[PDB]
C-alpha cells in the first residue's frame, strides 16, 4: 500500500487519477476526465489505512473530488470508497456516490451511485 | 411481522404504499405518489423474511416498483431494501435504488440512491 498507491490509475473509461499516499494516511492528487485536456483536472483529497492487515486483505481508502476548477463548476462532488489490492495486477475497486447541490424539492435526485475499478495500466 | 407488515405505510413525503405480506414471504401491493389521484398507483412486489429472529431484530424485506402504469411510463424502476421494526411505532427503514433505462453512454447516471422511512401514521 502507500508506496503501492502512489501513481497514476485509470478506470474503464479513461479517467486518470494521480495520487500521492503519504506516510500518515493522506491521499492527495488530481482527477482528469476523458479527453485529457489541460484542465478537465480537479483536486482530490482522501485518506487510506496506513497500517493495513498483514494477511491478504485490501487497503481501505476513499477520496473526494468537488467538480469545480477554473473552467468548470458542475456544482457537485463525488466520493469514492474502496480498497486497494496490490500485486502483479494491482487495482482499487470502488463504489462512488456523486451528489449535486439541489433545492430541497429536488434533493431526492441529488445522489447517483456507481462503481469504478482503477488499474495502473 | 407478516400480519404486522400488511397495511398502509406512508413516508415523510406522503407516498402511500399498501402491502399484503403473505404466509410464505411474498409482498404484493401498490405504491401511490403524492396528490393521491386515482392512478399515480403502480404495482409492487417484494419478499420479506417470514421466520425472522425472535430476538429484537428487524424483519428484512425489499420490493420493487417499475414506474409504468396506464397513464405514465417513466422508464425506470426502484427497489427498496430494508427492515420492518414493529411495536407501538412500527416502521420500515429503507434505502432505495432508482435506475432509469439509459443508453450505454449514459449508464453512469442511471442509478439514484436514497432512503425512506415509512410509518403507519
Amino acid at each position: 500500500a502507500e508506496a503501492g498507491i502512489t501513481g497514476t490509475w485509470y478506470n474503464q473509461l479513461g479517467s486518470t487519477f494521480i495520487v500521492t499516499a503519504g506516510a500518515d494516511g493522506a491521499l492527495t492528487g488530481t482527477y482528469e476526465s476523458a479527453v485529457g485536456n489541460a484542465e478537465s483536472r480537479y483536486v482530490l483529497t482522501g485518506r487510506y489505512d496506513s497500517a493495513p492487515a498483514t494477511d491478504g486483505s485490501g487497503t481501505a481508502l476513499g477520496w473526494t473530488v468537488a467538480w469545480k476548477n477554473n473552467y468548470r463548476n458542475a456544482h457537485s462532488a463525488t466520493t469514492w470508497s474502496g480498497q486497494y489490492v496490490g500485486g502483479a495486477e494491482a487495482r482499487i475497486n470502488t463504489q462512488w456516490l456523486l451528489t449535486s447541490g439541489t433545492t430541497e424539492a429536488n434533493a431526492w435526485k441529488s445522489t447517483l451511485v456507481g462503481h469504478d475499478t482503477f488499474t495502473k495500466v | 411481522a407478516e400480519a404486522g407488515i400488511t397495511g398502509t405505510w406512508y413516508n415523510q413525503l406522503g407516498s402511500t404504499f399498501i402491502v399484503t405480506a403473505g404466509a410464505d414471504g411474498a409482498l404484493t401491493g401498490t405504491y401511490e405518489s403524492a396528490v393521491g389521484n386515482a392512478e399515480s398507483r403502480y404495482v409492487l412486489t417484494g419478499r420479506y423474511d417470514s421466520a425472522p429472529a425472535t430476538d429484537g431484530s428487524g424483519t428484512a424485506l425489499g420490493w420493487t416498483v417499475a414506474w409504468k402504469n396506464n397513464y405514465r411510463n417513466a422508464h425506470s424502476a426502484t427497489t427498496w431494501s430494508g427492515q420492518y421494526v414493529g411495536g407501538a411505532e412500527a416502521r420500515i427503514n429503507t434505502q432505495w435504488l432508482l435506475t432509469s433505462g439509459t443508453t450505454e453512454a449514459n449508464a453512469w447516471k442511471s442509478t439514484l440512491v436514497g432512503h425512506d422511512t415509512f410509518t403507519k401514521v
Partner: peptide
C-alpha cells in the same frame, strides 16, 4: 455530460 466522465 459531467466532468467525472468528460
Amino acid at each position: 455530460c459531467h466532468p467525472q466522465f468528460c
